[PDB]
């Protein structure tokens, strides 16, 4: 009765209330990419270090 009246009135006269996807974007964190793939620097590259190390520590093992 009143159930029917409400059911009808409610459903018909506005089903959903307005919404916009564009507005949502502002209020949510946007995807942003990691910066740089990165490559590790060549650690202790070449015998520059070795020649230095042999001389630097010619320290024996006692």
């Amino acid at each position: 009765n009143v159930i029917q009246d409400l059911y009808l009135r409610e459903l018909k006269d506005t089903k959903l209330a307005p919404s916009t996807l564009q507005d949502a974007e502002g209020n949510v964190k946007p995807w942003n990419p990691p910066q740089k793939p990165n490559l590790p620097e060549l650690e202790l590259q070449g015998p520059e270090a070795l020649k230095a190390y042999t001389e630097q520590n010619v320290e024996t093992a006692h």
Binding site: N1, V2, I3, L6, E10
Partner: protein, 187 residues
């Protein structure tokens, strides 16, 4: 003890009066006299309803009783013994209350029931009659008991109806259904 027990003081008076006059089997007489004295209180609207207020003594009160039986000595006499009692107990503010209460007990003894059809507006006489018939038809009025179904206007209850009698109600009203509906849409 006589059917229907109205709990509460002043209805302890009514109960006593009722049971006493039921046991004296002179309830119609009592009722009639009670109506008459109630009427003569109402028809003594100033200076005998506006001096039911306490302030008067026992002795001044006794002279009020004398004035009451002076207005008509057509009183039952059991209700004159009740008048004396009320004077002695020094209350008479609830006098018409006791009368009304005796009325409930009395008309219960008669069997008469009262109902109600509260609505926002006075409904069809057809509705009134159909409901009275229906209630009499239904076990709700057991029969050997009568229904003074009274529609009352209560704009506060928006539309609808509530049928009332015997502390059993069926409430098909718009306000109540709306309440439940509002709630279900708060989910």
């Amino acid at each position: 003890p006589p059917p229907v027990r109205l709990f509460g003081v002043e209805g302890t008076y009514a109960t006593a009066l009722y049971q006493a006059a039921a046991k004296n089997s002179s309830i119609d007489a009592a009722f009639q006299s009670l109506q008459k004295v109630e009427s003569t209180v109402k028809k003594n609207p100033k200076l005998g309803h506006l001096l039911l207020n306490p302030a008067l003594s026992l002795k001044d009160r006794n002279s009020v009783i004398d004035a009451i039986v002076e207005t008509h000595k057509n009183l039952d006499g059991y209700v004159v013994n009740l008048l004396k009692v009320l004077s002695e107990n020094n209350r008479l503010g609830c006098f018409e209350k006791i009368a009304s209460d005796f009325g409930v007990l009395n008309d219960a003894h008669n069997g008469l029931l009262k109902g109600t059809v509260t609505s926002a507006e006075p409904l069809d006489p057809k509705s009134f009659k159909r409901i009275e018939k229906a209630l009499s038809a239904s076990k709700l009025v057991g029969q050997g008991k009568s229904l003074k179904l009274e529609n009352v206007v209560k704009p506060e209850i928006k539309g609808g109806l509530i049928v009332e009698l015997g502390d059993k109600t069926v409430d098909l009203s718009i306000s109540t259904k709306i309440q439940k509906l509002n709630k279900v849409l708060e989910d």
